[PDB]
Design a protein around this ligand. Structure first.
Ligand SMILES: COC[C@]1(C(=O)N2CCC[C@H](C(N)=O)C2)CCCCO1
Ligand SMILES: [Zn+2]
Length: 140
């Protein structure tokens, strides 16, 4: 589990969104595994606006932050799970690292701020849903 709290927005994995998130919905995209809801309190996270390919992510199943090198956001085939059929997930970045069920939502960050959140795992790989192109998260 986990979310990004920027401005008056809460960014979560779409597959982990709560009823309150759907009742206060700002934007959602199944192909990216992302959903954004509105919040009453202002958040403290800042979004990175860059092309970094190195950063650090939080792995809840290890209670540890790991430095990683990651691919550029791309269209990647993800195997069937209990949340989605086998499909192409867009704006996904892969790295070598531990990610098991429960780790979705952990933040990936670089020197500029938050880059994205854990969205996929298994096989010694971790995949992150990028948020750096969502410029509107910085306003309103
Ligand atoms: C932390 O990821 C959890 C999981 C995963 O990759 N899933 C399951 C959750 C949805 C993910 C997706 N974005 O399509 C795919 C569990 C299934 C296999 C090991 O990793
Ligand atoms: Zn950066």
């Amino acid at each position: 589990s986990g979310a990004i709290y920027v401005g008056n927005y809460r960014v979560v994995n779409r597959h982990l969104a709560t009823h309150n998130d759907w009742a206060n919905l700002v934007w959602e995209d199944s192909s990216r595994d992302l959903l954004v809801s509105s919040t009453t309190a202002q958040g403290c996270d800042t979004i990175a606006r860059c092309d970094c390919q190195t950063g650090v992510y939080y792995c809840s199943s290890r209670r540890k932050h790991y430095p990683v090198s990651f691919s550029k956001p791309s269209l990647i085939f993800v195997e069937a799970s209990e949340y989605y059929p086998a499909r192409y997930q867009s704006h996904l970045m892969l790295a070598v690292g531990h990610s098991e069920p429960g780790d979705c939502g952990g933040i990936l960050r670089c020197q500029h701020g938050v880059v994205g959140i854990v969205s996929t795992g298994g096989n010694g790989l971790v995949g992150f849903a990028d948020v750096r192109d969502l410029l509107w998260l910085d306003e309103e």
